[PDB]
Amino acid sequence: MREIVHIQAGQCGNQIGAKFWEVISDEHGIDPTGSYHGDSDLQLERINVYYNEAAYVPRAILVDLEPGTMDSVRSGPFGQIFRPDNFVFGQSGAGNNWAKGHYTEGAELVDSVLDVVRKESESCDCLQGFQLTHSLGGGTGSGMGTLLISKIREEYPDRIMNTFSVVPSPKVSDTVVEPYNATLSVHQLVENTDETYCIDNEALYDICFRTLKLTTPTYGDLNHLVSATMSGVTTCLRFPGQLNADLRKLAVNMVPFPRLHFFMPGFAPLTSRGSQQYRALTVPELTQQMFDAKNMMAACDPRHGRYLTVAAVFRGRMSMKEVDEQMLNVQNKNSSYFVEWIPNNVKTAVCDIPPRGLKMSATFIGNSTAIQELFKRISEQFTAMFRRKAFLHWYTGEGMDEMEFTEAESNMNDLVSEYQQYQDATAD
Amino acid sequence: RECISIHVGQAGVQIGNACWELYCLEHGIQPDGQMPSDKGGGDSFNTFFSETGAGKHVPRAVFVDLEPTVIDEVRTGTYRQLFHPEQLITGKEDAANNYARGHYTIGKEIIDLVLDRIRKLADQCTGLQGFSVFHSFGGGTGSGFTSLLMERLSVDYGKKSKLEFSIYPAPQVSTAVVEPYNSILTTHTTLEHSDCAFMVDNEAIYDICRRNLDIERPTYTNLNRLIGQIVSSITASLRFDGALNVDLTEFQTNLVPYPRAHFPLATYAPVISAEKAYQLSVAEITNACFEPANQMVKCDPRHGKYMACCLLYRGDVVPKDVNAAIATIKTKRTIQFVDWCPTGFKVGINYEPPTVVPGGDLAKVQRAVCMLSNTTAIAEAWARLDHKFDLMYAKRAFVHWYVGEGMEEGEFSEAREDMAALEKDYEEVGVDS
Amino acid sequence: LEQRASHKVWKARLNAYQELNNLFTKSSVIPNDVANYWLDPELFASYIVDSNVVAQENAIIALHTLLEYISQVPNVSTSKLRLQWIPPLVEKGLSSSRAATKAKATDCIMLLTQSDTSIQQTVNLMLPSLSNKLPRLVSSCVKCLATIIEEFGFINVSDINILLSEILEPLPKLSSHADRNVRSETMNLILQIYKWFGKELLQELLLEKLKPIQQRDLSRMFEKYEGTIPPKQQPRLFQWQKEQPFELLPPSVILDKFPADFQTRISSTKWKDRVEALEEIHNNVLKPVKKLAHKNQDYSDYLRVLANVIQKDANVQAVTIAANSVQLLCNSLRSNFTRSYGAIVLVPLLERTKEKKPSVNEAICSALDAVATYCGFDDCLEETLNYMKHKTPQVRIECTKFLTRMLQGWKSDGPLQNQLLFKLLPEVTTAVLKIVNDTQPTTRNTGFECFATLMKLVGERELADPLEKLDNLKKKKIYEYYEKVEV
């Protein structure tokens, strides 16, 4: 359990993936040239996880059927650091079709990716797991991504499969087949990934609009919250911590039931792009803003469900004793929103190094039953179109049978019912 | 004579560090394994150390982990030259707080290598006495791999005794949710292989450090140094000679009335921080052995019945002062013995002062005492584990992880049935006739 | 552990003696070469003198059950046994202070005596023991000596006068012994000699040399004996005494229908071309037929282009429609896949079991079932076992399920010794155990069935040997399927 192989697929996958590598390369003191220019040695203590040795190069693979984002990433600020051979980009696109990426033109390219996946895996002393960034409402990241997951699953059945899946919403993209793609993709993640961070774009939009007070949010405004959230939920993996050190230990503490591995991430404080928020929030503030709905990266109210498991990560120099008092308080004061039949389900870690720009931050990771609201929302949009069989010729023309839609819809509603099932279970 | 110490997992390895550091301080051994010339001299401590031809004293210890991270610090820190590198065994992939990984999947890859390096030490001994296993209850290696090693030692070294110092979990420092699962699973498969088991509730050591040392949030170093003090007092009978220094194997004959009732309760005193000026008498440190705030497993012996009571004194301690204190406590406290026990106290004395880590958080004391009592009240610890176990297992939460690593789900049921019988066995023993 | 019968530690020796006692009671009677404890009798002659009185007692009860086990023809080798065994039995078995250790040693001396032809080649060995320092030894083996005469008696012994005089020599010394028990047990031996002969004899030879109080006791003992002057029957016999179809359809030809735009299209970088090329010959050429031409038609050229897309084509859609054609071929071509046709598609189907889409796994399995119904275990058995040990967990569960399918419809030709039996434990039960002990639950669940489906065919006691190496838990999940499984 050491090295993590990172993969980004599709348009959104390579967007938030490149922005994530910019963030952690700075926190680890790595300039675009690949050299280390940091100061502390804790930055190099567990650099072997995400990077390799040079002469430091990211252990990342970039995949997309459309070569458009291939050049947008290489032209980016950190585009010169990625391995040239790790770019696996096909000829034609996916047309925002899950079936084109999963069955048709993504399967024609997936073998090229597994060759690069194998390459980075052979040079690993002990492969810890995999990490995927993609969008469920797209075509390549949704379709070809879930195919890559199921392919990695059959070739690395002993490694953890972790994903950063973003959720489609009408408030962002106006493509109508996104409920189809997300339903077909959720149908895969529930049976293939060991853990999945749900990144709702409807939540990201509502945050930039109603909290950061931005009238017209752009993708850079949305991807800023994503990169911050990704940096927090990965803090314990790249810095020498005691709790939830590797991928499996985190999944063993966060996933009580195999299909219920969909996490609701949170982060505080909610900063803007290059704005001014100097005064490091107090520990009681970081705790109150962590357990609210206005800082969740998923359009779900934690009041509507119960927390099965919780992982909190504080960053920056602070009183560890003052953290315990707050984390204890929010538990015994809101005990109804925490599962009783899982003792000590909340786990808090501390890291001295804050993210660049802040002195105190706190990242939330929750396995709440309220995440069923997110699936209820997608399942409602799915059926509205599916009852009229609109745009179904897209997927049937690529080989999919109409029954596949009914099954993916059924298994999602089963996942919703199960999240409600343990929301009603008691101790007695 | 000789005793081979085995340290499994992070807890076992990190505690062995604080223990062997204290062992070296007590015996005057330097980190390079060298000692001054005798200038005979009563040099008992060879039960825990071997001698190189070049005059180097090497611990009879094995450090095992499924991950190199912890033991790498050992073969890098101050005592890198103390151990032979053949005694520091590591894997690459750990058990991820999963008993089934440490016992079935990952642990079986390295079990043959560990037993080989142990046979090396066993073949360097003229007369082996037994094994001292150091492990946790919650970690995957400390629970899974330890119980695997205990099964194999009973097959190979069947005659030899095996003692374990187990780290009872506590939420204050708990690094895993499934720790009650691992605790029940390892207590079940090790119950018929262990001769004596000294549990160490991390909550007790955590609170004793907060109360008596005035440490806000104790680190693992604080807990380990306090634990190493107790482990030293228990093993001091084997490592030193003394006219009144009763051997530990003579205490086990009184502490274990039945094979399954082999969980004594250790109570150490005095624990004083190095901040102000203090000297406690024999009667005061003997009184402190019956204050549950000084125990290493949280439970109330007044709510139970004793089967044995052993006082391991070390320091400036005179026998007549002991019997005077015992007679006072026996007629001014409520020590309930079962009606089939002799009601007597077994006393051992070691006139060497208690050693502490220099510049540490524990103060050097003139005299100290470690009480080993076999009371039914320790079954309260099993109840706290069995309860957290029952809450999750009734929903089969986290079970798929174990079943996904070679373990049949029915082994959960078997292990819980054994803990249910173990709680009945403690209930039945305390009844009169 | 057979050599641990002389291990240093006693508990290991005690275990081997119990293991031996089970072998001699649970083995064959015709016997194993492993039961070679006749021809090296120094083995048990060493066990009887075990330095540990507890394990020594178990070495004797094991020697006892062995000693009655050997009561099976042709073991006339009982002459070598008495010489090597009853001196250790007398010196440290009858002399033992343990009532159980001594009771079984007397029971072994009885068996070794009836293995003989008479009592003389047993009396001569324990006669020196009558002059031992330890009175408890001479107290015990004069009682034994008296009970080998009471039950066996003097029959078929070469010279009785040399044997009578040999056993009557120490009797005056024994009846004046300091020990009260040695005297008492000698008076009982005199009664046994009295019972086989008269009173006239041992008054001529013996009774005059005893204390008058003693020969008065014997007179009282002779009065209390009611039986005839010699017993009209031996209370115990020696061993040698107890012995002596609607498939008349016209075969249609379909290898002509293949259009020219096929081998080019089926080998195209466009998936649509490969899908449509396979689908047209499936729906238009293979679908509307039921009986293909068995003679003068080499389908091997067509079968290998199906295996090429099954094994290597990334389009899972074509893999489905191609495997279906394989199923249709071997269905409509009964008794056709002799070797080349059956093998050209078998291993590509097994490799492609990795696909998890239910429609695809359905197509590949049904073709694997269809090739198995006409090639039972030609390559299948040997090739299926190879892919149960494959690195991918999905191909492990599917190939294991596939064996269960063939195993269910296993009718064979008979009578016995088929390819399955000779591979039962050398390879087949070993490959199933790997599935039974797999890390994943659903995988083990397949092996539990596959093992139970195996116990359904061959007697459940034949596989009890590998069943005991398994967990008691895995035994209950295997017995679980045994109730549900049939055929």
Ligand SMILES: Nc1nc2c(ncn2[C@@H]2O[C@H](COP(=O)(O)OP(=O)(O)OP(=O)(O)O)[C@@H](O)[C@H]2O)c(=O)[nH]1
């Ligand atoms: N007193 C004390 N307890 C410790 C220490 N290290 C770990 N523990 C306890 O051990 C439990 C977890 O077991 P570990 O030993 O850390 O895990 P492990 O044995 O390495 O097994 P894996 O990590 O799963 O491979 C936790 O409840 C901790 O409280 C230590 O240094 N001192």
Ligand SMILES: Nc1nc2c(ncn2[C@@H]2O[C@H](COP(=O)(O)OP(=O)(O)O)[C@@H](O)[C@H]2O)c(=O)[nH]1
């Ligand atoms: N947060 C975020 N979402 C994005 C971004 N780009 C695309 N998306 C979302 O992804 C969905 C479209 O998927 P896309 O990545 O463009 O197609 P793909 O190339 O086949 O994976 C839409 O619903 C968008 O909301 C981005 O930069 N940030």
Ligand SMILES: [Mg+2]
């Ligand atoms: Mg888009």
Ligand SMILES: [Mg+2]
């Ligand atoms: Mg560890």
